[PDB]
Symmetry: D2
Subunit: 387 residues, 4 copies
């Protein structure tokens, strides 16, 4: 009890998350498939704001136009019945065997064209359902061997695909934006644009860079041992955090997709502190898998746990930042000096400033403790409710 | 014998590499310090093209102007005696205790100003010695705890420092360029700009982005489990491979700095294949540590091994690419199709192309094997000399 | 050409390896299922010595006695037709949803009993087919959360299961032995007995420890960042290398199961050097997955590559050890002294030996270089055929 | 405030922890050396129970007998002044250059003998100071290359060294026991006995195995991506947890030695839950490094944080286990069934039990959810104080 989510909290879930049947590389499904209608209803009951989908989550692959219409009709009626939104959608360019060597960067040109047409079709549908963000996860773009993919060529093809997608949404007058979801590996041995940084750098070479941002996932950066709050900070600094995927992950191993808050709890705390202090206004989207040990009821407890954990961490981070003792510790550690310009007086003033070099007392500066440990223990006490 | 390096091969070494005394976090030095003069002479004898330096490698910290002049004079005479060049230099912003919380992103503003003045001083010296590249390795820019560094503020300070450095070299009319050397961690718990991608993305927000590239290191990207040849390919694609650091590393652990070729041998092969096929013309710089088990003679055998291993891999990669059977396998795997534009016919033609979607035979495409394993075994046979 | 395997080389393959249809967590199958008969025939044609199986690879789960008999009959006729052997078999205690919380350590007692009965049934079949080793891979024994499994209780249950299995084979007079296959994670978040060491230690608490050894897999120890040749050496030292699984893996990430020789090539070289120099006489078993990009022909090229790579590395390691220059380098590095007893003169002689402490010249010893780098470059030259 | 440690809590610290001057591989010291006397006094003031030492922490290397006596005399007076104990001691076989290739497993035989004599000398001193445990950390036992160390030979030498040490303490009638501290890597590329499992397995081949246990360190098992509470559980199961090193670590990277509670907070919670529920009665020893950003006051805040975090986690784990709602959830997840014997009725009864196989309803069992997520969210709510 307490920490009750409401749609105002902007919590969203992929249809593929609570709908995961439990198939893993070594195991058959442990749960029956879910009707997306029932997922929308169960999530709304938990306080979710909305759901997201792959084209093939909502409309089974190979569906006829008649079936397509009826699937969308039922989905639309579930959103109307609940008030749930659809802020984001994405294309499945990874499940069908045809994408075994990739979608946009498949060596076979005809597969690349098919991947683009499959995406364009779903962009139209996502706009009709109100999505503001279209996510691209190039899970099959990569290689297990060095000769199989010329990466420069593949980046050329990747740029062509995203440029074409940008040309398309511009030509329809759509307001939707694109977000690249990086992942370093799995299912490919190495995946192109493996981290937030690589995706941010890639975007700066696109024809219309303002149309594209990142959709970073907690577990994906942690799969490379990276600091996810640091990556988010650089995404925010670049103005490119269009969307975020929240979940949990225990270090460098297979993609776990634990519920948010599990995995690296302290990193979750610093992430929530950053998102709230930066004023991130996008969806708080959970891309997690209820473990296959769970039954139907365990699925919903897992989804509820994601939201609850976000709300607990939100309260603790806010109490941390509002605490006068923390505010004094932050001054003691010179976080206020970190926010001041190094040299607003300009280069020439810096060059003539004898206190910056010729008369800098390097030993007195070096002897100044940063007091980071007392600050960090204050953060821990706040996280744990032990103040 | 065979595989004999010559200065034409552009092999360079940091003074700090063969000069490493063997101090590690758990151990005292195992070798005496080297005079940079003797290192220049011993490396030239091995076939090196040149050496690189930290300011504090060449001139001991705190040196007087008179001592500074004599240190440079002796170094200059060693280069003249040997023909060795100095293509690159860098600032030590990590050893002195004053940098314990960083150089350019230290929370203390006066340390940030000192770090800039220390760098500017060394840029002048590096230009005098002929360096074309100035490397920045922010090894102390980062944190061990989440409250200690606001990363957005720190990126603001990092951008200010690099912009100021760019303003300086512009104001002197220097031709030297900057290269960011990323590293994900160590000595800080997490280091800012942790990978090639993060550095590439950062550079695109600098005031004069054309002045800045990356100096990626084999072991640093492998410390995050990333594919180093992939990262190099994205750097080349962006036109930003200004410099490279070659060494070896066994996966995700402390920074090993093994001689090049040790560590991930196959990744070294694919790296050399990429550098040569892309026509990389910069220095082949080794940033390695002769293990502290080695004596003075073991240092030079280790340095010789770096160059020899590059030359062996260069021969094998070239034989791989020139092999008609490999060239046929590459066509079989459709690497030629990967290099063709996905949709040179334009968006509207793609949208009307029924063979791209409505009449695409997705099952026939999916059943087409990529033949990647036969290609990879050809690469292995070439690497091993087992054709 | 060259490096042609023959059954004398003892190369074996799981039915599940070349038979893998390509289903991964993000993808549908890319190849049709194989009849085990055709796999036996295709592998024999490649020079394999034999095949191994899970109960459910050879007899589909839930088969009737009549179907069971006919499946075995056809399999037996394929072995007779080819000369192939079945040196090892194992139980599938991981695919069926009933094992979602484990087999022998499932929290539900009735599942643990079922797992034992399922294994006992297959031990009888494996003995009939001539298997000398029965492998246990507890892929589902573990947890994603800390409260879900009391590990001490689970080790009690694991010991009970293995003791019962040992009591069973003793009671039938079977000569078959058990081998634990460790894996640190995946499909569980953490797996019990995660490494060779943990399995070796566990075995020493079993009732009849001599009946049990390890079946270490290259990729599984590398998934924990461990040195696989080191782990094999400790298994050999303990006398417990009953079986081995050969494949490739690129560091710490999901279980890749690349063909042997791919992944960490140098670790493969040192492994083959150790297995041959120790005189390992068991099967050279490949537990690999032909990547799902491959078609049927790519499967067999991948299997052929496993064997070829073993044979190349075998030749190079042997040339390394037989080289008089290497033999001299090994003396220079004091590998001969490593093999001599530290104190065959006994404790009291060591205590009175003033040359061991009071008069030990610690600086002269410390100044002695180990010459490890020249030795390692000799190993690299031999591996690469660059002598 | 609250969570105040007392010596009854058995909190101990190495002299090398709070005494760490801040030298890392890239940096000079940031703090002056501490007199062990002042460390004993400052730790006692914080509520510590005792301190531990390397021979060379307490007596500078190469000290004369007169200096040795005076160093011990002053240390003894600090313990008498404070009431602090010395429960454990260890030998520095890693700092001096003579150990660059190892101590007990150095290739040079004379170094191995010296290492044994250096240890034996310190065992006498540790017994005089009251130590119950003597720790061996073979940080230099290992290799950076495959030819440099024959691991079977090295394990022979390691067994000889530990057997000799066991013969020595037996011959003096000492009650002290040995504890192996595993570490997977750093400072060597790979370290022998890399994990708790490998050390446990090694001990079972020693002549007097009952004399030897493990001293596992949180960060060392996490450096291999392993679950530390799982490793502790297997150590407890084997009856070998003689000592423990508590600290924090962020995943797979260099050895961080963060204060306990930092790093993987949830793993710390499950560790404390296990230690308390198993009734571990040994020292709660912190092997951590106050980050080199800290001054003298930051050192003591860091040490205080270790103890405080243990006490908070102890309270929360106890509240978790005592909660009737948690106790009901544990029954719902069948943790009570995990603790029951699988087959106390014996093998033959299991073989005839048709409910264990022929009539086992495998689908009804598989459909039973484990309810692990609701249990884990209860654990999270308890950890966070959000019940
Ligand atoms: O395409 C978007 C989604 O695709 C798959 O579900 C991936 O597992 C997930 O990481 C991503 O958010
Ligand atoms: O500053 C440049 C150099 O600094 C240090 O030597 C780092 O260890 C190295 O990675 C880098 O190349
Ligand atoms: O049960 C034995 C086998 O089971 C599965 O195939 C595992 O993937 C493999 O690692 C193991 O060898
Ligand atoms: O020798 C025992 C101690 O040695 C060193 O201090 C190691 O860093 C530490 O892990 C260990 O506890
Ligand atoms: Mg995602
Ligand atoms: Mg470098
Ligand atoms: Mg296996
Ligand atoms: Mg320790
Ligand atoms: Mn994921
Ligand atoms: Mn490095
Ligand atoms: Mn595997
Ligand atoms: Mn440590």
């Amino acid at each position: 009890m307490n920490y009750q989510p409401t749609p105002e909290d902007r919590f969203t879930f992929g249809l593929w998350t609570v709908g995961w049947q439990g198939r893993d590389p070594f195991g058959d499904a442990t749960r029956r498939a879910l009707d997306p209608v029932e997922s929308v209803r169960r999530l709304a009951e938990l306080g979710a704001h909305g759901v997201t989908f792959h084209d093939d989550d909502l409309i089974p692959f190979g569906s006829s136009d008649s079936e397509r219409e009826e699937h969308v009709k039922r989905f639309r009626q579930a959103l109307d019945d609940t008030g749930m939104k659809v802020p984001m959608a994405t294309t499945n360019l990874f499940t069908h065997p045809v994408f075994k060597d990739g979608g946009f960067t498949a060596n076979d040109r005809d597969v690349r064209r098919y991947a683009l047409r499959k995406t364009i079709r779903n962009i139209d549908l996502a706009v009709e359902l109100g999505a503001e963000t279209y996510v691209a996860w190039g899970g099959r773009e990569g290689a297990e061997s060095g000769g199989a993919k010329d990466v420069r060529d593949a980046l050329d093809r990747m740029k062509e695909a995203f440029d074409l997608l940008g040309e398309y949404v511009t030509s329809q007058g759509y307001d939707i934006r694109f977000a690249i979801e990086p992942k370093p590996n799995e299912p490919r041995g190495d995946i192109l644009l493996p981290t937030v940084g690589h995706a941010l750098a890639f975007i700066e070479r696109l024809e219309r860079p303002e149309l594209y941002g990142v959709n970073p996932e907690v577990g994906h950066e942690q799969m490379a041992g990276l600091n996810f709050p640091h990556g988010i900070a650089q995404a925010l600094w670049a103005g490119k955090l269009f969307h975020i995927d929240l979940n949990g992950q225990n270090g460098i191993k297979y993609d776990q997709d634990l519920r948010f808050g599990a995995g690296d709890l302290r990193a979750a705390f610093w992430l929530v502190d950053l998102l709230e202090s930066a004023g991130y206004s996008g969806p708080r989207h959970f891309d997690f898998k209820p473990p296959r040990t769970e039954d139907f009821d365990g699925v919903w407890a897992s989804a509820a746990g994601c939201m609850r954990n976000y709300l607990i961490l939100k309260e603790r981070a806010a109490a941390f930042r509002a605490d006068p003792e923390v505010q004094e510790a932050l001054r003691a550690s010179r976080l206020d000096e970190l926010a001041r310009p190094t040299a607003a007086d300009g280069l020439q003033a810096l060059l003539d400033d004898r206190s910056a070099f010729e008369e800098f007392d390097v030993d007195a500066a070096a002897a100044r403790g940063m007091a980071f440990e007392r600050l960090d223990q204050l953060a821990m006490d706040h996280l744990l409710g032990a103040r």
